[PDB]
Amino acid sequence: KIVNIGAVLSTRKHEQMFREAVNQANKRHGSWKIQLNATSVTHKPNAIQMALSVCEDLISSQVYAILVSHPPTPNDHFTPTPVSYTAGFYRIPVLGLTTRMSIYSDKSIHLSFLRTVPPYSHQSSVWFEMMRVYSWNHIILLVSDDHEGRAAQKRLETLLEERESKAEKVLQFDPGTKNVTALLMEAKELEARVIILSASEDDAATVYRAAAMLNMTGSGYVWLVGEREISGNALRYAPDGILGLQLINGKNESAHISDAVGVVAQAVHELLEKENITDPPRGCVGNTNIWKTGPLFKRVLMSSKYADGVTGRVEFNEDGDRKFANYSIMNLQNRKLVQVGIYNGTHVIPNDRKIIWPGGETEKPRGYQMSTRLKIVTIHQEPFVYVKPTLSDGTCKEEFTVNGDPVKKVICTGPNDTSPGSPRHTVPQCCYGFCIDLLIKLARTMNFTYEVHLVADGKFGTQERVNNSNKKEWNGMMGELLSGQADMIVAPLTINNERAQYIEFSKPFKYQGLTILVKKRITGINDPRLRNPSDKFIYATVKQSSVDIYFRRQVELSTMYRHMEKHNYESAAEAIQAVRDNKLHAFIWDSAVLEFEASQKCDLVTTGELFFRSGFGIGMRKDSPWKQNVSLSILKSHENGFMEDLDKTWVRYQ
Amino acid sequence: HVSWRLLDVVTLELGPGGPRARTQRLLRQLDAPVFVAYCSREEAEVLFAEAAQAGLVGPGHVWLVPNLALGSTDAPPATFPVGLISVVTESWRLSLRQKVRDGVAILALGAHSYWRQHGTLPAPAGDCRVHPGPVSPAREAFYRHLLNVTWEGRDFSFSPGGYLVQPTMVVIALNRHRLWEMVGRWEHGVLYMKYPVWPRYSVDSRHLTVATLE
Amino acid sequence: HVSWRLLDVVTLELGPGGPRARTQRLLRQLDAPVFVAYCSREEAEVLFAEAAQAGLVGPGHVWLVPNLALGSTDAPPATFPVGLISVVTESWRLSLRQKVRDGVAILALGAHSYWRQHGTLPAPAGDCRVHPGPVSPAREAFYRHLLNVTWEGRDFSFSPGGYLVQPTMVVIALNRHRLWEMVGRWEHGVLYMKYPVWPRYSASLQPVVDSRHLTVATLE
Numbered sequence A: 001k002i003v004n005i006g007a008v009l010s011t012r013k014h015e016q017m018f019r020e021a022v023n024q025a026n027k028r029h030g031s032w033k034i035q036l037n038a039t040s041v042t043h044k045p046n047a048i049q050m051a052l053s054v055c056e057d058l059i060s061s062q063v064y065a066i067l068v069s070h071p072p073t074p075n076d077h078f079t080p081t082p083v084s085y086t087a088g089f090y091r092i093p094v095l096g097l098t099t100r101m102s103i104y105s106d107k108s109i110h111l112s113f114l115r116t117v118p119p120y121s122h123q124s125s126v127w128f129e130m131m132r133v134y135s136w137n138h139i140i141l142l143v144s145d146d147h148e149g150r151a152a153q154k155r156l157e158t159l160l161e162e163r164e165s166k167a168e169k170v171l172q173f174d175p176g177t178k179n180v181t182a183l184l185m186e187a188k189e190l191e192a193r194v195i196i197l198s199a200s201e202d203d204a205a206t207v208y209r210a211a212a213m214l215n216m217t218g219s220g221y222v223w224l225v226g227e228r229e230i231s232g233n234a235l236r237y238a239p240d241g242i243l244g245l246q247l248i249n250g251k252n253e254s255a256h257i258s259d260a261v262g263v264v265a266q267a268v269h270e271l272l273e274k275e276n277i278t279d280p281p282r283g284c285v286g287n288t289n290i291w292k293t294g295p296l297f298k299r300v301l302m303s304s305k306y307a308d309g310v311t312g313r314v315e316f317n318e319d320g321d322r323k324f325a326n327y328s329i330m331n332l333q334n335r336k337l338v339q340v341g342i343y344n345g346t347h348v349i350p351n352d353r354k355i356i357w358p359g360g361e362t363e364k365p366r367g368y369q370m371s372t373r374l375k376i377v378t379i380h381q382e383p384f385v386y387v388k389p390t391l392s393d394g395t396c397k398e399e400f401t402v403n404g405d406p407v408k409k410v411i412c413t414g415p416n417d418t419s420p421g422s423p424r425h426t427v428p429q430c431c432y433g434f435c436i437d438l439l440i441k442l443a444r445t446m447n448f449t450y451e452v453h454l455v456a457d458g459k460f461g462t463q464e465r466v467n468n469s470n471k472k473e474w475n476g477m478m479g480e481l482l483s484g485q486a487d488m489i490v491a492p493l494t495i496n497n498e499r500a501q502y503i504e505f506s507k508p509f510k511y512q513g514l515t516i517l518v519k520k521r522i523t524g525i526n527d528p529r530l531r532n533p534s535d536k537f538i539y540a541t542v543k544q545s546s547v548d549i550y551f552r553r554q555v556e557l558s559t560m561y562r563h564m565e566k567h568n569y570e571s572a573a574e575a576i577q578a579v580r581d582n583k584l585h586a587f588i589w590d591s592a593v594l595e596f597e598a599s600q601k602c603d604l605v606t607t608g609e610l611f612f613r614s615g616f617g618i619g620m621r622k623d624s625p626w627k628q629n630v631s632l633s634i635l636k637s638h639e640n641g642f643m644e645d646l647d648k649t650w651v652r653y654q
Numbered sequence B: 001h002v003s004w005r006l007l008d009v010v011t012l013e014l015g016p017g018g019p020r021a022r023t024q025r026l027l028r029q030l031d032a033p034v035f036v037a038y039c040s041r042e043e044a045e046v047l048f049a050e051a052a053q054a055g056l057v058g059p060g061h062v063w064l065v066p067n068l069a070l071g072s073t074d075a076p077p078a079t080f081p082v083g084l085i086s087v088v089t090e091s092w093r094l095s096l097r098q099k100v101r102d103g104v105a106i107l108a109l110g111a112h113s114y115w116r117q118h119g120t121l122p123a124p125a126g127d128c129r130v131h132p133g134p135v136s137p138a139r140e141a142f143y144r145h146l147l148n149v150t151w152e153g154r155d156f157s158f159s160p161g162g163y164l165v166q167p168t169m170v171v172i173a174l175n176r177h178r179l180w181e182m183v184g185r186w187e188h189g190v191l192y193m194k195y196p197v198w199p200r201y202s203v204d205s206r207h208l209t210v211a212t213l214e
Numbered sequence C: 001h002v003s004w005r006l007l008d009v010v011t012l013e014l015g016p017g018g019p020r021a022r023t024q025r026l027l028r029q030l031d032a033p034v035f036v037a038y039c040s041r042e043e044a045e046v047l048f049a050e051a052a053q054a055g056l057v058g059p060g061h062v063w064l065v066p067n068l069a070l071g072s073t074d075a076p077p078a079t080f081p082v083g084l085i086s087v088v089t090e091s092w093r094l095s096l097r098q099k100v101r102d103g104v105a106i107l108a109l110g111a112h113s114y115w116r117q118h119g120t121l122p123a124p125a126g127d128c129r130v131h132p133g134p135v136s137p138a139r140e141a142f143y144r145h146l147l148n149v150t151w152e153g154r155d156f157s158f159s160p161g162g163y164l165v166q167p168t169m170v171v172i173a174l175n176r177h178r179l180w181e182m183v184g185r186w187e188h189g190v191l192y193m194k195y196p197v198w199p200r201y202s203a204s205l206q207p208v209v210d211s212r213h214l215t216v217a218t219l220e
């Protein structure tokens, strides 16, 4: 039972080296029960004749596993295609000594394949490890349009979704293009301060020179690239301080031979005993059939736990990855490279001396360039936000209060001067209230700069699957916050589960709930008049509100929505006049503002107690840098009786 | 715009000859009213035999399989449960002569469509030996000209990946006579039907009949 | 009251010369975190080595076996995973001299109980020349009187079956040095444990504590 294998190579000197290596590795066992062999050929330019030569190798010996390498020719992607396709028809295992392209990782197009060197996707994982070292959490992922680009983006997406913090505005550019300045200029606005790139070498030089023209290689920033972005001629356009990384002992592959035969040896003596092996597919013509045991041999070889090759302990993944290969981190230390870190799977050891960042500062630079002029959005609410027209002199009434202290007012732009019907009138109004004073305190504490402007929709905003069916984009104010129209939200805004996914909330500063309003009396939600709606009494709420979602997610209460959706004023405090008009009897709304209405006005009564608990709070975009501080500030105010004093001044004396 | 209360996902591996021991228990454990499967034809035969051994085959359960399996439409295989649903493109009229009539006609019409407006007849490539043509010439647009096409009322609108988009296709099922029969189709609009109710054709069974009044 | 949802019961053949393919095939396909197995020492060694072949001896799986195996109790053999769990009675480390002394003591205390009851012990009939096995009348009373005993804090007991009932027992394990160390005690139907959470070791100590378990602190 002479078990025979083969291996094709490139330089015809590594062929002699392979012959010597295989005959030396034959000395592992010589018990005469099992023997080994080898046959080697060299490459050729034409693909079709090369594949015919592979078929000649197939017929010339009942082969067991072919091995492939790369020649010094620069035709990268056209190198390993024919052998895999031809040998896949008989489930003949193939071993790629060195090929880093992404496409081969898919076991559905090259169903028989095994690799020892990891593809370009796996190095992305290393970045994540590095990303956790210095606490960077806002990224700018820059990638090309090639299949490797999609693979890298997908790998980084799943690895981020493991911890599931965020990605930040990935943008892809076409391959082999010039003047990429448009996308870079578009993405230069964002607050993130670290970029990641993985594309072609010429594309790397082009993006390097374009960023140099746009002045992005300067101080403070840092962006790191993959493996081939710091090779070839890309160094002729690269600035100092960009991180780089390569594999420990690649592109040699002679030592890699010393691994491959090894594992296949560790395979052969473990396979010939299963039950009924007895044959590989003999012939290369006419015999239209597959090997009866191909999948078995491939699966057994895949799970092989090899002991020690030249390149450490080598295993395989579910698809044939490198399984804990090594990586060396080099720095562009004044147009050179210095090995600063060793990545072996669990971390990167900073055993080196010093790392220089693109800015020249020798300390670890953080990203998240903090802005100074925010874009604050607000909404008209009776006891919290007061809006008035201005005196044509340039502002509105500057006068003392009951106590004599000046009530501070700002100037906010905003609406169209008429909510239901008007083209637009974007005019400045004078703008003062409780939340305005709280924002004044916050700005004084944290050195802010504010430009307040109202919403155009006039509504808070819920989920709405529009007639153009798609993902339900957020409505009005929340869409303005998410799209980038606004940057921070200060208003009497509820905190609910449906909003917690995309927004980060601060600690609540005023506890409040839901309560009924009538003009006398009434009861909570128990009466049959509400269990069974009556033609006399009318129950209406504010449309596009959190209460709409609350009544749109209750199983038993669904029918009340049937009433509520029938007629509900898509309106505001204007709908308050409904209770004055004796049309709408019951108005279900938030406790604080509706209770202030009872005290300020007359003949308006609130019945019973609350039936729901929530809270107001300042919200910001997902994982904004300010959160902690802002929250802390609010809590500190709550300690000093500031909130109680504001409560007194604004809604007590009434 | 629906709920789709999905039950669960299960992954199976079987070497049918000997290693299917744990697969039996794993297939016993499940419980769901709708099953959708995905495997090869021989793998389908062993999987359905194992399911029949397990017992989760009753008429109260329905199987769903893509066109990848059940390729041999012209021959109803054995050990297959009656009343499953599979979906195929327009191929009932297909045959050797049908494919012959389709292919050359579409290729020639595509060759002439680009000529219809300032065009010329194409020429073949070099050979399989010289390995020529590194660049993509203007004639590649001729290949791009083979995207939009129409004939015989059937829409052969294509896709940038090498397949057809907006297709006309039918949904099939196995009746009690062990022969593939037409059940419905999707003619560019919404689903059609020939049997408005599922006949659940064939003792410790399910889907009991319930009669009521309002 | 707990559900105790069984997964599978598997019977295997394990003779010194036997089909290894069948056992390996039946063992390689399994899915459960805990194991209970009933086998002898010469059986346990072979089965444990074969399980060590097919990757099932990590810090995630736990094995429990009765007192049938682990006969040596002083020389724990190889191929035994660290963390093996078994249950043995008291006198787990008592001296052989101490054991025989305790046996003589309980017999003497039973004899003393019989004299206090009636006055003396019965005469023996041990002729292995005749050996008639004539009749019960008197010796059965001595047996029934000896059926219960208690001496020097050791509370023994007996049943109609020749095995003592409800003694204080221990639950032992294997430390990181392949040595039997006491883990838990068992008295009067209430069970203790000296380790609040099962320390799981990996290839060499370095317990790779799980990612889905945490320590909550609270106060009265």
Ligand SMILES: *[C@@H]1O[C@H](CO)[C@@H](O[C@@H]2O[C@H](CO)[C@@H](O[C@@H]3O[C@H](CO)[C@@H](O)[C@H](O)[C@@H]3O)[C@H](O)[C@H]2NC(C)=O)[C@H](O)[C@H]1NC(C)=O
Pocket: B113, B114, B117, B141, B144, B145, B146, B147, B148, B149
């Ligand atoms: C869809 O398939 C049709 C079927 O042949 C193809 O028609 C394309 O239609 C465009 C529309 O303008 C035509 O382009 C030509 O551009 C030249 C520019 O000077 C102009 O002089 C012509 O009068 C004509 O407008 C042309 O018929 C054809 N496109 C090309 C590139 O030849 C075409 O394959 C598909 N349509 C498209 C837009 O690709």
Ligand SMILES: *[C@@H]1O[C@H](CO)[C@@H](O[C@@H]2O[C@H](CO)[C@@H](O)[C@H](O)[C@H]2NC(C)=O)[C@H](O)[C@H]1NC(C)=O
Pocket: A252, A253, A254, A255, A310
């Ligand atoms: C390719 O790798 C092999 C093995 O890692 C290298 O050969 C080793 O070279 C070192 C230094 O000269 C010696 O100490 C070892 O004894 C060699 N090992 C063997 C098995 O010969 C080889 O030099 C590498 N070639 C290149 C171009 O990097």
Ligand SMILES: *[C@@H]1O[C@H](CO)[C@@H](O[C@@H]2O[C@H](CO)[C@@H](O)[C@H](O)[C@H]2NC(C)=O)[C@H](O)[C@H]1NC(C)=O
Pocket: A344, A345, A346, A347, A348, A349
């Ligand atoms: C890979 O390299 C890392 C760092 O050089 C090694 O990490 C150490 O592993 C020990 C356990 O052997 C742990 O105490 C820590 O995780 C690390 N020790 C430290 C930081 O002092 C790791 O062992 C190496 N090998 C791998 C991951 O297989």
Ligand SMILES: *[C@@H]1O[C@H](CO)[C@@H](O[C@@H]2O[C@H](CO)[C@@H](O)[C@H](O)[C@H]2NC(C)=O)[C@H](O)[C@H]1NC(C)=O
Pocket: A625, A626, A629
């Ligand atoms: C959050 O607040 C802390 C403390 O108020 C800020 O840290 C201070 O930053 C300034 C300028 O960068 C330093 O002069 C102080 O010494 C820092 N404080 C301490 C205690 O070291 C921090 O910058 C704030 N972060 C954000 C995002 O607002």
Ligand SMILES: *[C@@H]1O[C@H](CO)[C@@H](O[C@@H]2O[C@H](CO)[C@@H](O)[C@H](O)[C@H]2NC(C)=O)[C@H](O)[C@H]1NC(C)=O
Pocket: C113, C117, C144, C145, C146, C147, C148
């Ligand atoms: C349990 O022990 C007690 C004494 O320790 C014994 O009970 C005596 O049994 C004799 C036998 O007929 C009778 O005199 C009485 O039933 C008991 N007498 C006294 C003074 O206790 C006996 O060994 C055990 N009990 C039983 C019921 O057998």
Ligand SMILES: *[C@@H]1O[C@H](CO)[C@@H](O)[C@H](O)[C@H]1NC(C)=O
Pocket: A002, A003, A004, A037, A038, A039, A061
């Ligand atoms: C062994 O390899 C040599 C290499 O040329 C070949 O000639 C011979 O036929 C092979 N024999 C077997 C049994 O594989």
Ligand SMILES: *[C@@H]1O[C@H](CO)[C@@H](O)[C@H](O)[C@H]1NC(C)=O
Pocket: A179, A180, A181, A182
């Ligand atoms: C093209 O390059 C020029 C460089 O002078 C630049 O000004 C221009 O904005 C670029 N155009 C685009 C679309 O990027």
